[PDB]
Structure 1
Amino acid sequence: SVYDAAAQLTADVKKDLRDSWKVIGSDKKGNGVALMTTLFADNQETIGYFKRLGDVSQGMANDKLRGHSITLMYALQNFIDQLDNPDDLVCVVEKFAVAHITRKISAAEFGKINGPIKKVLASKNFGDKYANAWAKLVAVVQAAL
């Protein structure tokens, strides 16, 4: 199932992912927090999954939220780095899904991250072309949930 989803990562899609990551991934703390605070603002219900982080309204100043946000970006760094070898991409995505499946996060839930990604990309001047590419990468993860 994950292999079939990975098949949608065409040469052009991988190129747009790598080009946009070159910018987004250069400030993992800043963009990681931006992603999370945007998720919480647009889909407040997702906060139910992050009780451990405490007062998420503090944003960057919240050490636990910052710690999670920075760490989240390294999962994406991992994915981007494995783009050229489907076998490696698949095994890392399945590994990544394990902990999220245990948390009972469905593919539909996970997909809520698409909006925030689109907004973060747009803040760096990366249009819909790039947003759609990222939606395809997220789809590979969804296929594993």
Structure 2
Amino acid sequence: VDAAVAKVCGSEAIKANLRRSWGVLSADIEATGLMLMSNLFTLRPDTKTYFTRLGDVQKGKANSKLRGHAITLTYALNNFVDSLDDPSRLKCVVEKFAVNHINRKISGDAFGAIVEPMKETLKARMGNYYSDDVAGAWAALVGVVQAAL
């Protein structure tokens, strides 16, 4: 976990990419979360099995439990982005979110299912400002959680 935290917090390029991409995503926090969850279930349909409390996750915004989840997820991303100045903050925030996923029996490999969904969400919502390094930055951040799982 410490090594993974340092990879993120110690890289100005990763921090700048997370911040500029978050700038775009924050134009519509709710829509970002719903699009990310849609891409999760589309690009990784195997993950649907974990989210049955939410009912028909394919219904998007109309499914209120999915909507509430998607919004909360997006504030978790907001939290990560606001944790970049303090490796100890990023660590404890990651550890908190890891506790939740460990208790839902989500492995590091399973959690990594988000990476391609996130990449596609970034492409769709950033347009020509997308770059592969932006996806890499978010993959590195996900890697911190994976190390904690």
TM-score, with normalisation over the residues of structure 2? 0.93
How well do the aligned residues superpose, as a CA RMSD in angstroms? 0.9
Runs of 4+ in structure 1 deviating by more than 4 angstroms, as ranges, are: none
Question: Match of 2:14?
Answer: 13
SS of match in other structure, 2:27:
coil
Distance (Å, rounded) in 1 between the aligned partners of 2:113 and 2:48 = 12
1:144 has 2:148 as partner = yes
Q: How much has 1:74 moved relative to structure 2?
A: 0.7
SS of match in other structure, 2:7:
coil
Question: Match of 1:43?
Answer: 44
Question: Match of 1:66?
Answer: 67
Distance (Å, rounded) in 1 between the aligned partners of 2:44 and 2:120 = 13
Distance (Å, rounded) in 2 between the aligned partners of 1:16 and 1:44 = 28
> Comparing both structures, which one devotes a greater share of its residues to helix?
2
Distance (Å, rounded) in 1 between the aligned partners of 2:67 and 2:146 = 25
SS of match in other structure, 1:143:
helix
Question: Match of 1:83?
Answer: 84
1:78 alignment partner AA:
N
Distance (Å, rounded) in 1 between the aligned partners of 2:27 and 2:5 = 25
Distance (Å, rounded) in 1 between the aligned partners of 2:107 and 2:26 = 26
Distance (Å, rounded) in 1 between the aligned partners of 2:40 and 2:58 = 12
Question: Match of 2:132?
Answer: 128
Note if contact 2:44-2:117 (Cα within 8 Å) is conserved in structure 1. no
Question: Match of 1:119?
Answer: 120
1:39 alignment partner AA:
L
Over the matched positions of the two proteins, sequence identity in percent amounts to 53
2:147 alignment partner AA:
A
Aligned positions, number: 144
Structure 1 unaligned spans of 5+: none
